[PDB]
Enzyme design. Structure first.
Site, PDB file in Angstrom:
ATOM      1  N   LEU A   1       0.831  -1.197   0.000  1.00  0.00           N
ATOM      2  CA  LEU A   1       0.000   0.000   0.000  1.00  0.00           C
ATOM      3  C   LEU A   1       0.868   1.250   0.000  1.00  0.00           C
ATOM      4  O   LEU A   1       1.859   1.330   0.734  1.00  0.00           O
ATOM      5  CB  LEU A   1      -0.916   0.041   1.228  1.00  0.00           C
ATOM      6  CG  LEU A   1      -2.190  -0.791   1.288  1.00  0.00           C
ATOM      7  CD1 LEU A   1      -2.938  -0.476   2.583  1.00  0.00           C
ATOM      8  CD2 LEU A   1      -3.072  -0.537   0.076  1.00  0.00           C
TER       9      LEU A   1
ATOM     10  N   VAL B   1       3.228  -1.872   4.765  1.00  0.00           N
ATOM     11  CA  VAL B   1       1.793  -2.085   4.890  1.00  0.00           C
ATOM     12  C   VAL B   1       1.264  -2.609   3.567  1.00  0.00           C
ATOM     13  O   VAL B   1       1.516  -2.013   2.511  1.00  0.00           O
ATOM     14  CB  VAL B   1       1.051  -0.800   5.298  1.00  0.00           C
ATOM     15  CG1 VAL B   1      -0.410  -1.123   5.571  1.00  0.00           C
ATOM     16  CG2 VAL B   1       1.701  -0.168   6.528  1.00  0.00           C
TER      17      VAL B   1
ATOM     18  N   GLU C   1      -7.992  -2.138  10.208  1.00  0.00           N
ATOM     19  CA  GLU C   1      -9.076  -1.895   9.268  1.00  0.00           C
ATOM     20  C   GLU C   1      -8.568  -1.051   8.107  1.00  0.00           C
ATOM     21  O   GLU C   1      -7.585  -0.314   8.225  1.00  0.00           O
ATOM     22  CB  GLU C   1     -10.246  -1.201   9.964  1.00  0.00           C
ATOM     23  CG  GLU C   1      -9.955   0.234  10.320  1.00  0.00           C
ATOM     24  CD  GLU C   1     -11.051   0.866  11.156  1.00  0.00           C
ATOM     25  OE1 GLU C   1     -10.721   1.719  11.995  1.00  0.00           O
ATOM     26  OE2 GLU C   1     -12.233   0.504  10.984  1.00  0.00           O
TER      27      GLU C   1
ATOM     28  N   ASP D   1      -5.150  10.551   2.753  1.00  0.00           N
ATOM     29  CA  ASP D   1      -4.658  11.135   3.989  1.00  0.00           C
ATOM     30  C   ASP D   1      -4.721  12.660   3.893  1.00  0.00           C
ATOM     31  O   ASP D   1      -4.776  13.246   2.805  1.00  0.00           O
ATOM     32  CB  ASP D   1      -3.245  10.628   4.346  1.00  0.00           C
ATOM     33  CG  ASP D   1      -2.133  11.199   3.463  1.00  0.00           C
ATOM     34  OD1 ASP D   1      -1.312  10.398   2.962  1.00  0.00           O
ATOM     35  OD2 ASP D   1      -2.034  12.433   3.297  1.00  0.00           O
TER      36      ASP D   1
ATOM     37  N   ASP E   1       2.318  11.840  17.802  1.00  0.00           N
ATOM     38  CA  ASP E   1       2.704  12.149  16.424  1.00  0.00           C
ATOM     39  C   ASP E   1       1.502  12.642  15.627  1.00  0.00           C
ATOM     40  O   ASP E   1       1.286  12.237  14.481  1.00  0.00           O
ATOM     41  CB  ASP E   1       3.355  10.945  15.728  1.00  0.00           C
ATOM     42  CG  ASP E   1       4.249  11.355  14.545  1.00  0.00           C
ATOM     43  OD1 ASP E   1       4.685  10.450  13.809  1.00  0.00           O
ATOM     44  OD2 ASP E   1       4.539  12.571  14.358  1.00  0.00           O
TER      45      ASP E   1
HETATM   46  N1  LIG Z   1      -7.236   2.512   0.560  1.00  0.00           N
HETATM   47  C1  LIG Z   1      -6.412   2.714   1.652  1.00  0.00           C
HETATM   48  C2  LIG Z   1      -5.075   3.093   1.485  1.00  0.00           C
HETATM   49  C3  LIG Z   1      -4.262   3.305   2.585  1.00  0.00           C
HETATM   50  C4  LIG Z   1      -4.744   3.146   3.878  1.00  0.00           C
HETATM   51  C5  LIG Z   1      -3.848   3.347   5.075  1.00  0.00           C
HETATM   52  C6  LIG Z   1      -3.534   1.996   5.810  1.00  0.00           C
HETATM   53  C7  LIG Z   1      -2.861   2.193   7.151  1.00  0.00           C
HETATM   54  C8  LIG Z   1      -3.615   2.309   8.307  1.00  0.00           C
HETATM   55  C9  LIG Z   1      -3.008   2.485   9.540  1.00  0.00           C
HETATM   56  C10 LIG Z   1      -1.621   2.555   9.645  1.00  0.00           C
HETATM   57  C11 LIG Z   1      -0.985   2.745  10.977  1.00  0.00           C
HETATM   58  O1  LIG Z   1      -1.664   2.773  11.998  1.00  0.00           O
HETATM   59  O2  LIG Z   1       0.315   2.877  10.969  1.00  0.00           O
HETATM   60  C12 LIG Z   1      -0.865   2.439   8.484  1.00  0.00           C
HETATM   61  C13 LIG Z   1      -1.476   2.260   7.252  1.00  0.00           C
HETATM   62  C14 LIG Z   1      -6.070   2.767   4.042  1.00  0.00           C
HETATM   63  C15 LIG Z   1      -6.895   2.552   2.952  1.00  0.00           C
END
Ligand SMILES: Nc1ccc(CCc2ccc(C(=O)O)cc2)cc1
Lengths: 9, 273
Positions: free
Chosen positions: B12, B20, B89, B96, B135
Site C-alpha cells: 500500500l 503495509v 481496518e 490522507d 505524532d
Molecule cells: N485505501 C487505503 C489506502 C491506505 C490506507 C492506510 C492503511 C494504514 C492504516 C493504519 C496505519 C498505521 O496505523 O500505521 C498504516 C497504514 C487505508 C486505505
C-alpha cells in the site's frame, strides 16, 4: 510556489 | 495462521505508511491493512495481560480499539520470529490529510473546523483510554471521503499517557513543542495541544508554520493566508511558548471558532462529494 514536504518521524 | 486467514495483496502507498500491504479477511471479505514491524527496529516494548511481550504500538492500539471510529482499529496481530504483524481496518475510499491539503490548498474554515473537531474528539478518546499518540500531523490522519470521518493512524511513536514529565520523543520534530527543542522535556497533554495548533495552522494556511528550531522557539506566528481573527487567536493560543499558557482540550472545544461544527455526513456532502 512554496515547497511543502512531508517530515519523517 | 496469517496466510490462511487473510488474502494478502500488494504493498500500500509504495511504503509511505511503512511495510503495509492490502489484505482481505477470508472470514468475511473484510478489507484490511497488514502492517509489519521488525523486532530489531522496535523502540518501546510493552506487556499484555497474558504477560506476552509485544511492541508498545500493539498495547496502545488495543487500548483505543473500543470501536470509536475516530482512531484506526486493530483487528488482530501475530508474532513472527523476526517481526510482528498488525491487522488494521482499511476504510475506503480514503485520502490522507497531507495529500488532501496538498491538492486542495488552504482549507475553507468551515471544513477545517469539522476536521479539527473530529481530531480533537479522537485525541480525547486516546487520552481517556490511557494513550498518548505523540505524532499528531496531517500525514497520520485519514479522511473517509464517503462518510466525512477522520481517522487517526500510526501509534508507533506513542506512549502510555502519564502525568509526569516525558524525556524521550520519537514523533515529528516540526510538530514538537519548544520545551522539547530547548529542554528535551515535555508533559503529554500540553505537547499534544501544541501539535494541534501546528495542525490547525496547516489546515487553514495550506502548510505548517515552522520548518526550523529557531521558528519553533521564537514565538511568532505569521499568517500567509487570510484567516479569521477567531481562528488566528485559537492557533496562537495553542502555540503559546509556555506549556501552562496553552488551552486545555475543553477550552479548545469551547473556543468561539469551534462552535456550530458540521456533522461528518454534512462535511462529506458539502466538501468531499
Ligand atoms: N485505501 C487505503 C489506502 C491506505 C490506507 C492506510 C492503511 C494504514 C492504516 C493504519 C496505519 C498505521 O496505523 O500505521 C498504516 C497504514 C487505508 C486505505
Amino acid at each position: 510556489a512554496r515547497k511543502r514536504r512531508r517530515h519523517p518521524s | 495462521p496469517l496466510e490462511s486467514q487473510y488474502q494478502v495483496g500488494p504493498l500500500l502507498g509504495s511504503g509511505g505508511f511503512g511495510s503495509v500491504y492490502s489484505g482481505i479477511r477470508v472470514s468475511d471479505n473484510l478489507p484490511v491493512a497488514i502492517k509489519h514491524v521488525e523486532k530489531d527496529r522496535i523502540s518501546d516494548w510493552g506487556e499484555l495481560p497474558n504477560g506476552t511481550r509485544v511492541p508498545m504500538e500493539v498495547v496502545l492500539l488495543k487500548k483505543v480499539s473500543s470501536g470509536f471510529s475516530g482512531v484506526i482499529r486493530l483487528l488482530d496481530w501475530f508474532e513472527r520470529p523476526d517481526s510482528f504483524v498488525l491487522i488494521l481496518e482499511r476504510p475506503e475510499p480514503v485520502q490522507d490529510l497531507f495529500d488532501f491539503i496538498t491538492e486542495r490548498g488552504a482549507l475553507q474554515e468551515e471544513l477545517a473546523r469539522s476536521f479539527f473537531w473530529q481530531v480533537l474528539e479522537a485525541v480525547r478518546h486516546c487520552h481517556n483510554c490511557g494513550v498518548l499518540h505523540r505524532d499528531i500531523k496531517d500525514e497520520n490522519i485519514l479522511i473517509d471521503l464517503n462518510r466525512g470521518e477522520l481517522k487517526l493512524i500510526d501509534f508507533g511513536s506513542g506512549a502510555l499517557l502519564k502525568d509526569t514529565v516525558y524525556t524521550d520523543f520519537d514523533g515529528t520534530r516540526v510538530y514538537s513543542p519548544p520545551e522539547w527543542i530547548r529542554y528535551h522535556r515535555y508533559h503529554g497533554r500540553s505537547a499534544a495541544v501544541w501539535s494541534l495548533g501546528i495542525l490547525l495552522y496547516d489546515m487553514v494556511c495550506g502548510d505548517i508554520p515552522f520548518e526550523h528550531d529557531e521558528e519553533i522557539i521564537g514565538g511568532q506566528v505569521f499568517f500567509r493566508q487570510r484567516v479569521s481573527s477567531e481562528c488566528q487567536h485559537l492557533i496562537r493560543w495553542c502555540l503559546a511558548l509556555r506549556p501552562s499558557d496553552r488551552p486545555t482540550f475543553e477550552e479548545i472545544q469551547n473556543h468561539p471558532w469551534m462552535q456550530d461544527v458540521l456533522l461528518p455526513q454534512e462535511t462529506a456532502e458539502i466538501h468531499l462529494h
